[model samples]
Target: GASKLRAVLEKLKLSAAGMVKGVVDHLLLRLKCDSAFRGVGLLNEHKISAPNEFDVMFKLEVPRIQLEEYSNTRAYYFVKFKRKENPLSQFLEGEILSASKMLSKFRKIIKEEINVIMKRPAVTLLIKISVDITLALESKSSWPASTQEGLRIQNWLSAKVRKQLRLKPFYLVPKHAKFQEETWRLSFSHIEKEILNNHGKSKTCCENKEEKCCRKDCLKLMKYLLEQLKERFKDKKHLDKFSSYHVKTAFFHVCTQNPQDSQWDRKDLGLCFDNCVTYFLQCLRTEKLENYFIPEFNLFSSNLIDKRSKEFLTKQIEYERNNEFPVFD
Candidate 1:
């Protein structure tokens, strides 16, 4: 089964890679954009499949920016320029950097100079393997008090590491709804990627032949299981409420609970994966799945997933576990 999945993913990877390069080339050449391209999808983490997703952070060098938090969740922000004669002033509506206006300008440029199939939070390419290119404004500032309290990894990682991670810049993504008008969504993709890259108790945990951890493997399995369930219940109402983020948060919590690298030994993949699933089910049943980086935000409550869907997910997992994972087959 892995061989089959790997073969399919290999072909998909090549197609996706080519399309991403083309878009990057076009963006840099036409817009003269300052951006960083990285894989933030299943493909990036060695997962079997990703829906051709890649995140691009269009870096805007703001000498001084004032951020306003418009949501209690501390996940939405609006940028206001502090200095005159700013490099990004041309795109700004008055002194404030309107995410909607900038995104519109970027979309217009893409349409004129490149191909765009869909324009939402990210620009979707009209290629064989579609690419989702997100535009984000990078800023260096202390996170809000609520956000600082949210990243509760002190029990697992060292204080120095936590400080270093928190010090890193955050991004403002153009993801807002009609109700939350003009409120740019806060993005932690950079932090997520960094954690995944350096995810081990020891520095050399996943590096040498002697040490191998199943943390990533377990995440892949969890994501795969979630995808299969969604497909099976494609027509069901409220099933769409669930997303890969919930599974990812559960995986993070599982790691924190079992911080020792030996606990996630490659040979213990089955045990580790089962543990992750158990944690996810527990969160669903309790209706309190906290975002790993934002403790105050309850993903379950925010999504409004009802009791029926939670029960359905529990039953589905039980069936998969008892039936030797027919979804994988």
Candidate 2:
């Protein structure tokens, strides 16, 4: 089950970047055991290899980002699979790593984004791996071995991939079936800047008011974000396809990534291209009309559209130039 995979992820104690390889190696080792011999044979027949090879390594070029969301940051990575390579097999199945290293990175990015707008003192990161296919909770947080969060996520992923390739489950976790886990790891890194500015200062700035530089707003924003649990994310039954998690992440990004408009402000664009959440939060305080936003359904549908997000800066600059109010005042 996916739970077991998470355990494996824990056992591996993976660092960032190389998580995928660690998982594949671990799964391959397990398949060598007699207990997994059958599964191994089945996978081999399908030519499904764990940590599958990429015929070509294409560097993903992403533009300067202005929106916040895991997917939004990832939109820069466009997969250009080799035509001759055997993509995920139809009957292919795979193990679920406890969580993707990318998930951990995503949480960090989100926290960083939050800080750009309202850095808080203490931030909590909540991680939940759920089965979007089954709509069941799998695992929450870094702990919880008894829970089936990992398995449920694994099952959901296997089912999704099977449906996409028009194949059936490989039974004993295939090499391609991935578990679905969403991390809500909370951290005050979101408002780190604000916290630092008022760190030891007792002036009104350190008072932490809800209306003005208060952590409460950050908390509320976090709470508002949770409202998106179970929201539609990726395509149904497609392992390689996107899921509800992706959608929810994108939605949160819309609220926190869009820029603001004002005479005394500079657009809350974060220091990095991936820091959309920070920009969005700062954008929220914009008093100007054009600085406001309406969630767009198709904002994430295409790379061209996603890349065009820079247009948001145009709007921000226009508003500020006309009003002479920096977007960040």
Candidate 2, residues 205-261, lDDT tens digits: the string is: 324332132222222222222222112222322212222233234323432332121
Superposed Cα RMSD, model 2: 22.4
Best-performing candidate as measured by lDDT: 1
Model 1 pairs whose backbones collide: none
Q: What is candidate 1's local distance difference test score? A: 0.70
Clashes of 2: 51
lDDT value, residue 187 of candidate 2: 15
What are the per-residue Cα lDDT tens digits for candidate 1 across 1-329?
A: 33433443345446466667777676656666422122111212122455555555555445467887665655666778663356565567665677777777767766777744664577766665566666776667777665767665666666778899999877677766437656676667777777777888788989997789878777777888888888888898656888887888888888889888889887777777788888999998889987787787677873567888888888988898777677776
Q: Which candidate tops TM-score?
A: 1
Q: What TM-score against the true fold does each predicted structure earn?
A: 0.85, 0.18
Predict model 2's lDDT versus the native. 0.25
Query: What is the Cα root-mean-square deviation between model 1 and the actual structure?
Result: 4.6
